Symmetry: D4
Subunit: 148 residues, 8 copies
Amino acid sequence: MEFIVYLAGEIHSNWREEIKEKTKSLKLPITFVGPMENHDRSDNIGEEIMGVQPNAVLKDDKASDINNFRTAVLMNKADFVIALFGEKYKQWNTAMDASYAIAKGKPLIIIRPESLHHPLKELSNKANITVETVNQAIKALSYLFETE
Amino acid sequence: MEFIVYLAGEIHSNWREEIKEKTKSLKLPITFVGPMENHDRSDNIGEEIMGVQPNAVLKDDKASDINNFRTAVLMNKADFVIALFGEKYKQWNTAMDASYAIAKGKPLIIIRPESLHHPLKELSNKANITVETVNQAIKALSYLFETE
Amino acid sequence: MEFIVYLAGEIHSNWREEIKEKTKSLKLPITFVGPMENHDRSDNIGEEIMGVQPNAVLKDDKASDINNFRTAVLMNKADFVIALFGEKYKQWNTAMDASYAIAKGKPLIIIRPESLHHPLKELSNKANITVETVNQAIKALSYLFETE
Amino acid sequence: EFIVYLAGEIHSNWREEIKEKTKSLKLPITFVGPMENHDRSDNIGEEIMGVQPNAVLKDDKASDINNFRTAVLMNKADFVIALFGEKYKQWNTAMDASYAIAKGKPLIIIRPESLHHPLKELSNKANITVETVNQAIKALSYLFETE
Amino acid sequence: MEFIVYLAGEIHSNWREEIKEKTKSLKLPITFVGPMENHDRSDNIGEEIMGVQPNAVLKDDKASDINNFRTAVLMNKADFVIALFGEKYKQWNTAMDASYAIAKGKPLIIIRPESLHHPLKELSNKANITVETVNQAIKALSYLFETE
Amino acid sequence: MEFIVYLAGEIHSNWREEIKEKTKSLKLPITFVGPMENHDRSDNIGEEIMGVQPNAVLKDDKASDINNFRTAVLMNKADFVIALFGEKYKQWNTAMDASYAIAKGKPLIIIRPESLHHPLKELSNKANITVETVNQAIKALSYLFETE
Amino acid sequence: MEFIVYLAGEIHSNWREEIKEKTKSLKLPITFVGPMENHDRSDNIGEEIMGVQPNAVLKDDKASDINNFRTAVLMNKADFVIALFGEKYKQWNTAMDASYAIAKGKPLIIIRPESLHHPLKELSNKANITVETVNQAIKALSYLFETE
Amino acid sequence: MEFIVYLAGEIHSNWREEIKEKTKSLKLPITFVGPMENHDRSDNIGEEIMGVQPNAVLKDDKASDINNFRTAVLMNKADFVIALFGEKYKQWNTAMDASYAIAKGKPLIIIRPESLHHPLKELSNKANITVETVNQAIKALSYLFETE
C-alpha cells in the first residue's frame, strides 16, 4: 500500500526537502504533505484572500483561517506524522500538530536535538519515536517496509 | 492526491457551475459532489419513487427520504465541504449541511455576502474559512496544492 | 435518572419558559440548558469581555466566540435537544444546533408550525420527532417516563 | 458541576488567581491540573522508579508519571483553560491545548497580545482567546448567567 | 457503582416484572429501563400526539417517531442490554435493539428458548451471553457483583 | 466515486440478482457484497471448517462464527446497505444487519411489502428509505448520480 | 472526584488485596473493580449457569461468556487500568486486558518484575507507566491527588 | 476489492509463509502485513537506529519504539487480523495484537492448538473464529469470497 505522511515543523530551514530526497532514493511508497513552506506567503495569505485586515492580530488570525484549513485537510489524508523541532522560534505550531497527531491516534515520529529534550519531554514521551536526525527517522521509515 | 468536496447550498441558482468551471481551469484534483440541482426534480422525487402522498407535508418528507439519502452517501465520501448562502430563501438545508460538516470534523468553507454576517455569526465562527465570493473560495482551494 | 435537555432556538420569544413550567407541573426529572435569552446581552457579550471592536463583523464574531463556547459546553452536557423554529428571523443558529444534535447522535425534537414545513423538510426528516406546538413536545417528554 | 483542566507553565501561580476569583463568584467549577511543584514534577520519575542513566531518561520517566496524571485528569475535564506567558518554551502547554481541540473539549486560551503571532494557529482553533484571567472569569460566569 | 439496563423485547407478556422482582430481592445496584409496556398505548401514541393519520402505515410511523425517541434516550443511558425473544410475533424490533447494543459496544444478554436457536444463531453468536430463561440471566447479573 | 453496497436479507430466494442485473444495466458505479447465498453451504460451514459438533445449537453457533466473520468483513467495506424483508422466515438476521447499518451510520434502504409495515415500523422509521419493490430501490440508487 | 480502576492480572494469588488496602490506608478516592477472584468459581461459572458441557473447550468457552461479560461491564466503568504480570501462568488474559485498555485510550499502569521485561517489551512500551512493585504503583496513584 | 490482513504471532518460526503461499495459490485478493520476521533484526532495531543502549531494558524499549511504530502503521492499514499461538515463548505480544484487533472492531481469526485452549479461553471467546490449523483458517478466508 502507499502512505501519506504529514511533515509538521518550522518552514525556515529545508529540513523537509532532505526527508523527501532521501526517501525517494530508497523508493519508499511514501507521499509527503505539509504546510506552505514559504514563510512570507504563509503570513500574508489571510490578507491576500480576504483583503488587508486593519490590525496585525487580525492579519494573523485571517492567515490562520487558511493555514489551519490547509493543515486540517492534509492531516485528514495523513496516515502518520513526522514533526521536527529546532533551536529557533517558539514553534507552538509544531507542538500543536504533533499533539494533534497523538490525540487522533496517528503514529508520530519526533525529530529533535537532545539539547531540547527537557522542554519536549512530555511530547516526546507520547510520541512513538524520538530521534535527533533526519537520517535516523529515515531508518525508521525504511524498517516499515523491510523483510529481513 | 484526490479530494472529494461537497457543495452545500441553495439549488435554485447555478452557483456551483462557477466553482466547477474555475476549479477545472486550474486543474486542481478536486471532484465536487452535492445535491440534485434540479429544484423541480428534487421537490418531486419522493412522489416519483414512492407514489403521490396524502398531503404536502408528506410529499416533502418523502422527497426528504430520498434527498437526505443522497446527501448522506455523498457527504460520507466528502473530504471537506463548501456551503454558500445567498440573500434569498430560508436555506435551513444549507445551515444543516454546514453544521453537519463541523460536527463531523470535516473542514468547512462558508461563502456568504457580508450583508448576512449577523444571521450567520455563530456558523461562520465555527467554520474554517468564511469568505464573500466564489473567487475567494477558489484561492483557498489552490493554496491547498501550492508550493509557494 | 436525571436528564439534561438543550432548548435551541429564537431567544426573542418566551417558549422556553412555557416548556420549563409545564415540565415542572408534571415533575419530570429534566433540567433545561440553553443560550443566553437576553438578546442585547447576547449580541454584545463579545465587546463586554474583549472590549469594543473596529467593525460589526468583528463585534459579531467576538460575541460568537463566547456564545459558541457556552453552547458547546452546555451541549456536551445535554442528553437530548428540543429545537423550536418560528416565522421570524433567519434562525440559521437554530438549524445549526439541531443539525449538531443529529450529527452527534443526540435525540432531537423539532417544534415548528406546519406552514414552515417545506423549508424545514430535510431537517425535520432527520429529527426523531417533529411537532407543531409546545403541548405536543411535552407529551413526548412525558411518554419518556410513563408506565401505561 | 464542571471539571476544568488548567494547562500551562507551573513556574508561576496563575492558577491560584483563577481558583480564588471563581470561588468568590460561587461558580460550580472544580479545577484540575498538573503537579504545580516544579522540582517535585521534574524528579517524580526518579522518585518512583529510581535514578536514571542520563538526563533524557530522567526526564522520560518523569513524563511517564506526569503524562499519566494529565491523561487521567484530562479524561475527567469538561473543558480546558490554557495560559501562556513570555517565559519558558511552554511546549507542554501547547500540547495540552491542542489535545483539547483534537478531542472536542472547548478551550479558552489566556495569552498576552505580544504573543499573538507565535500563537496564531493555536488561538485560531480555540473557542476563546483572551489576554487576562479577569476576561476568562467573565466567559465562565457567562456560562451560568440568565440575563 | 450503579448500572442502568435496557430490557428490550415483546411487551405482550410480563417477563420484565420477573427480572425486576428477582433483582430487587438480590438488592443488586441495577435500574431497569425499557419501552412503554402497554401495547395499545404504544400502538396509538403517534396519533395521541400528532392526531389521526391518513392511513395505517402513517399511524405506525408516527408511533415509531415517539417510541424510537423513547428507545434512543433510554438506550443512551444504559450500560448494558438484556433482550428476550419468545415464540409469538415477528419481533423484528427486539432484534433491532439487540443488534443496536452490539454495534454500540454495549454488553448484551439474550434470553431465548432453545426452540428458537436456529433463526437466532447469528444474533446470539454476537451477544456476550445467550441463555434460555430469566433465572439464568439473573445468575449472570449476580456474578457481576459476587466476591467468590 | 465507487460504492460498495451490502445486500442484507434472506438467502433462500433470489432477489439479489435482480438488483445486481438492473444496477449493471444502468451502469451504476456500485459493487454489491452479501452473505453466502447457498443455504445448505451456509448452514454447514461451521462443521466443514471446525468439524462435526455435538448438537444442533453448536452446529449453528460454529456456522455463525464463520458467517458473522464474512458479514463483518464485508459490512466493513460497505458504504451503505440494502435490506429486503419478505413474508416467509423469521429474518432476525435481516433485522440484525439493517439495525447494525443504522447504528454505525451507514445509510440504509429497506425493501418490504406494505403488508409487513406494522412489525417493521420501528426499523423502517430509522431507515433512510423504505420502499415496497426492487425497482423503487433502483430508482433511489440512480438518483444518487443523476444530474437533472 | 471518584475514580474507578480495573485491576487485571492472574486470579491465583491475592496481589489485588495489597493494592486495595494500601489505597484505603491513604484514603484515595478510588474504587477498584476486577474479575472473579476465586479460580474454581471462575472456571465453573459457565457450567453453573448454562448446562454441563460436552467437553473441556465448551466448558471454558461458556465460562468465558460470563467472565468476558463481567470484564466488559466493569471495564466500561473504569477510568484507568492496572495490570500485574507475575512469573507463573500463561497470563494471556492479562495481556488481553492491558492491550484493550491501551486500545480504548484508558491510561494503563503495568506492574511486572524486571525479569519479564523482554517478553513484555511491546506492552510496557505502550503502557503509561511500567514499574516493578505494587508500592511503586501506589506512589503513581498518590501523585494523582498530591498538591506538592 | 482487496483486503489487507495483519499476521500477528511469534517471529521465531515460518508459520506465516504457509498462510501467504496457500492464499496466493487460491488467488484471493489479500495482501498480508506483519511485524519484522527476522528475530535478530527485530531485537536490535532499537540500537541500530538509536545507538547501543545502557542496559537490556533500554535496548528492548528502543526496539519497541520502532517495532510498535511498524505495528501501529500496518494495523491502521489492515481490514482484519490473524493471530497464531504456539507452545513456545511467552507470546504476550501476540495476545496484545489480538486484543487490539478486538478492541478496534477489526475481525479476528485465532489459530491455536487445542492443548492451549484453557489459557486462551477469554481471548478465543472474543475472536470471530478460533481454529487449530492454518488449513482451517484458509477455508475461512476462501469462504469470504465464495459464490457457493
